[PDB]
Design a binder for these strands. Structure first.
Ligand SMILES: [K+]
Ligand SMILES: [K+]
Ligand SMILES: [K+]
Ligand SMILES: [K+]
Ligand SMILES: [K+]
Ligand SMILES: [K+]
Ligand SMILES: [Mg+2]
Ligand SMILES: [Mg+2]
Ligand SMILES: [Mg+2]
Ligand SMILES: [Mg+2]
Ligand SMILES: [Mg+2]
Ligand SMILES: [Mg+2]
Ligand SMILES: [Mg+2]
Ligand SMILES: [Mg+2]
Ligand SMILES: [Mg+2]
Ligand SMILES: [Mg+2]
Ligand SMILES: [Mg+2]
Ligand SMILES: [Mg+2]
Ligand SMILES: [Mg+2]
Ligand SMILES: [Mg+2]
Ligand SMILES: [Mg+2]
Ligand SMILES: [Mg+2]
Ligand SMILES: [Mg+2]
Ligand SMILES: [Mg+2]
Ligand SMILES: [Mg+2]
Ligand SMILES: [Mg+2]
Ligand SMILES: [Mg+2]
Ligand SMILES: [Mg+2]
Ligand SMILES: [Mg+2]
Ligand SMILES: [Mg+2]
Ligand SMILES: [Mg+2]
Ligand SMILES: [Mg+2]
Ligand SMILES: [Mg+2]
Ligand SMILES: [Mg+2]
Ligand SMILES: [Mg+2]
Ligand SMILES: [Mg+2]
Ligand SMILES: [Mg+2]
Lengths: 89, 64, 44, 93, 50
RNA sequence: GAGCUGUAAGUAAGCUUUGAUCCAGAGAUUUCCGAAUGGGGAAACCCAGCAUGAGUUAUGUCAUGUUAUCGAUAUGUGAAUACAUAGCAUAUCAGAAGGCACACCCGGAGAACUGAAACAUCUUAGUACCCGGAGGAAGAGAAAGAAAAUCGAUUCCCUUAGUAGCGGCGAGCGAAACGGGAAGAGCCCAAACCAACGUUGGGGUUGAGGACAGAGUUACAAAGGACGACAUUAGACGAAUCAUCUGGAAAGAUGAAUCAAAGAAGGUAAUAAUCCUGUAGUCGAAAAUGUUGUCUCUCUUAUCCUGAGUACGACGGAGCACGUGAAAUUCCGUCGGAAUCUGGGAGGACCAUCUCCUAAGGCUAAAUACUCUCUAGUGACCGAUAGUGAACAGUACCGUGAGGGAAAGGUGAAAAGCACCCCGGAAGGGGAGUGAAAUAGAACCUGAAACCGUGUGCU
RNA sequence: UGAGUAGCGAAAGACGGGUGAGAAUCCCGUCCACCGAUUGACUAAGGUUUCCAGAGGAAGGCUCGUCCGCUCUGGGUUAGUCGGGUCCUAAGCUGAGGCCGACAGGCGUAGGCGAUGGAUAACAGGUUGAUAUUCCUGUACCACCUAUA
RNA sequence: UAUAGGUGCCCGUACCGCAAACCGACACAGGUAGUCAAGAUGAGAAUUCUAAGGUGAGCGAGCGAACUCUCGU
């Protein structure tokens, strides 16, 4: 279940500053809670989690040509480790 | 792959399911960091999981 | 000048929403008519 | 009946009477690509590149292995597997 | 209740109903007494009064 | 049987003759909302109780199962109240719910504009709308019938006939029987009376009968099997043309051939029976659904009664073509209320005679009605302001909402969709190229008129 | 057609410097002017990405535009304590059984839902282009769990 | 009738917000609940000028006729 909870890492300027501060940003399944996120990270990466922050992103308006629709809604989790680190390369 | 999967035992198929899911998850992380360069492995691993779950489901229905 | 439409999420959903339509026989007739016409939107 | 690598003769178009090997096939368009047939002279932006354009499959015809005449294609069931036979002579392709 | 017409002298017609002469009566349904509405014609043409 | 990763390019990475993509049958998976059913709720969300199981020292968190209401079945607890009953728990089941083309059908309920040259009876019309219930059909159906020499269940078609009749005898409404056809089918109970514990089995099913003294899962009783055959759901084979001319291209023209149980139709660079897909014809099924057969299979070989709150009557209504009429016939409400084969009903008030029939229990295929669908086809039907509102949409847009509701098809045979040079920030142009053609350059076939410009022969 | 006509939606701008193919209209600067019980600041409803950065100038902007609430690409919303739910009830709505009604349905008991009210534990500072009582720093508080007590 | 260690979920959080982003078909002189409430003057949240802060209003340049409008004598 844990590898379903964690979808992908998020790579941005703000996420990179977070990684400099030992915070790792993941896109997670939109149904899971932050406790599940913490358990999944601990299990997958064999690290210790200090805290997990979470937020939702609404669908964003997007178009190509005459077709206007929306992107997928997102759930973003920021995981603060107390022990260890995660190698994304 | 189904013919080869059917040669595996029940405990082996579960182990294959776990290991395939880990491989797929590793592929997804590599894709998100722009490191993959081999994107056809993703579909191949996904269908292997589908075949593995199909064979397990057949055995349980057959035995039941 | 104060106009007629003063939008209100709660009022809109309570008066014109799916559950309000479901709650009466005539509301279900509305939903059936819109499904028959092929509307994308059935209710608020 | 027309397959890649087959030797065919063009029976309609600018290249009528020409012969050449079937470079490629396109079943959804019912078209084929034949070596040295239907050159197109496209403007490429990286010059003028000469390449063959597809032609309708019904504009080429297989050649008879015996009499070299253009022939239509029939089928037989030699040793179970379906095989191609020239309608002109009756010999396999 | 049935439906028909009230007719005037000029034969104007208005819709009306004919209602049964229902009388609430203590009756033994399924072996247990209960007060049910039963018509007088039915009572004369023996439910079973208890 | 060689390509393939939808439309759909575009790359990227791959799959596929060790048989992929694709097609058909059968299976597996099938998030959440929705009758929605653990509780709630502003649909697609929030919050839980039990049991089981990961996990954690432990809590938090997580996974599976289960928990609506009314119903059935059977175990308890059990009021006022003695007994009981109601009620309350449990256990098992899964019966109902909602949806539709709900078009056609049956039932409940039921307008008005309108016509009558006004209008109230009447008409519009038992129509529209609403509500309930179902099926592939429904409804009706086995004479208390039609009739007046006799026929023999029901339904539907023709005709009878715009007749008989109804009608402020106005406007209008309007049969049926006979005759001709489609189709065709008949049955089961209640009761007399027997034998077992009033309830069960036997008895019986009618115009006089009864008591007494080979047929079938289409009604007539209901479950299976064995096998065959046929059909549908993928497919396969399938005859016969070459040359020259004009052309960018030949199927056109000309010449000379060929096939035909195949000269239907599409496509192919212009108009093809012989180039392609096909057509006539013929073949084909692992699997699943259907139809239909033989064997099997079972089932079977006038003493008494004959439908009672009924028939019928009065009042008030309704349905009958029929408006209360001389109104028979059928139904509803209220109230009254028979007879018992020496019986009862009908033959258009009613009486008598005669004739026909035997109500107050039930079942019953077919000929009939309809088309959102599916398969195969058709048209002196449309051809982009037409034809669906919709050839690219119930979308855009409008409205709080019910709801209203568009516009918009065409390069070219083939993208060969204009390399490169020049002015220009770009847009756009001029060349050069592709193309048969670019005033076919995508706002792309043809390119009318209004309208807007440039030049000028006469004025 | 009217016709290059009416209009271009309350008001104070000027100059220097810059950018640029192009500047009254964009950026920077100085001076000037206007609001200031507000043209300032903060909540709510409502809207729903309009927010930020880089790039762009066809169309939108009543002129222009190098600019923008416009176009392209990539980003941005962090909570035990804030507001709401896992608490409470009001009006009202709904309602097991139940009462009533041609049908459809109407009403209603227990109960339930329902804030605009009641209850309820966190403050100050720092930090980004875009979040902050949410991140970070310092110092707390509340509920629950386990161990010593 | 105390200390100690540990755990703490879901939804919202961007931005506009007396408006160019809400209701008014508009980048519309209109409408839109509550809160904060500086100095001089003053009874005052009146008046005038200012503070904090914000703004110069999405067509301009001339001319300085009739006429119209808004102002002063
Ligand atoms: K009906
Ligand atoms: K008239
Ligand atoms: K008996
Ligand atoms: K009467
Ligand atoms: K909001
Ligand atoms: K002047
Ligand atoms: Mg949050
Ligand atoms: Mg539910
Ligand atoms: Mg519910
Ligand atoms: Mg139905
Ligand atoms: Mg009239
Ligand atoms: Mg052929
Ligand atoms: Mg009679
Ligand atoms: Mg009888
Ligand atoms: Mg046209
Ligand atoms: Mg049209
Ligand atoms: Mg032309
Ligand atoms: Mg044209
Ligand atoms: Mg004009
Ligand atoms: Mg002028
Ligand atoms: Mg004028
Ligand atoms: Mg003027
Ligand atoms: Mg003017
Ligand atoms: Mg202005
Ligand atoms: Mg303000
Ligand atoms: Mg911005
Ligand atoms: Mg402009
Ligand atoms: Mg933008
Ligand atoms: Mg109620
Ligand atoms: Mg901000
Ligand atoms: Mg904010
Ligand atoms: Mg808006
Ligand atoms: Mg405004
Ligand atoms: Mg305003
Ligand atoms: Mg006000
Ligand atoms: Mg003032
Ligand atoms: Mg403006």
């Amino acid at each position: 279940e844990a590898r379903d909870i964690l979808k992908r890492p998020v790579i941005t300027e703000k996420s990179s500053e977070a990684m400099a501060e030992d915070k790792y940003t993941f896109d997670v399944d939109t149904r899971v809670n932050k406790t599940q996120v913490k358990m999944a990270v601990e299990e997958i990466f064999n690290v210790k989690v200090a805290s997990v922050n979470i937020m939702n992103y609404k669908p964003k308006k997007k178009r190509m040509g005459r077709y206007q629709g929306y992107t997928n809604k997102r759930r973003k989790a920021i995981v603060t480790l107390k022990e260890g680190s995660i190698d994304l390369f | 792959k189904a013919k080869e999967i059917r040669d595996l035992t029940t405990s082996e198929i579960e182990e294959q399911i776990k290991s395939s899911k880990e491989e797929l998850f590793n592929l997804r992380f590599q894709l998100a960091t722009g490191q993959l360069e081999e994107t056809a492995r993703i579909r191949t691993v996904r269908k292997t999981i589908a075949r593995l779950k199909t064979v397990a489901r057949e055995r349980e229905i057959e035995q039941s | 000048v104060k106009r007629t439409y003063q939008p209100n999420k709660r009022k809109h959903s309570k008066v014109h929403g799916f559950r309000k339509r479901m709650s009466t026989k005539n509301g279900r007739k509305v939903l059936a008519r819109r499904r028959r016409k092929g509307r994308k939107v059935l209710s608020a | 009946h027309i397959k890649k690598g087959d030797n065919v003769k063009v029976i309609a178009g600018k290249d009528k009477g020409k012969e050449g090997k079937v470079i490629a096939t396109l079943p959804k368009k019912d078209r084929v690509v034949v070596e040295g047939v239907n050159i197109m002279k496209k403007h490429q932006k990286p010059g003028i590149l000469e390449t063959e354009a597809a032609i309708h499959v019904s504009n080429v015809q297989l050649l008879d292995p015996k009499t070299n005449e253009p022939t239509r294609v029939g089928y037989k069931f030699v040793d179970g597997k379906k095989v191609r036979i020239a309608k002109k002579s009756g010999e396999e392709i | 209740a049935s439906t028909g017409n009230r007719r005037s002298h000029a034969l104007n017609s208005t819709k009306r109903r004919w209602n049964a002469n229902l009388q609430k009566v203590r009756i033994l349904v399924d072996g247990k007494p209960k007060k049910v509405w039963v018509s007088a014609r039915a009572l004369k043409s023996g439910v079973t009064r208890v």
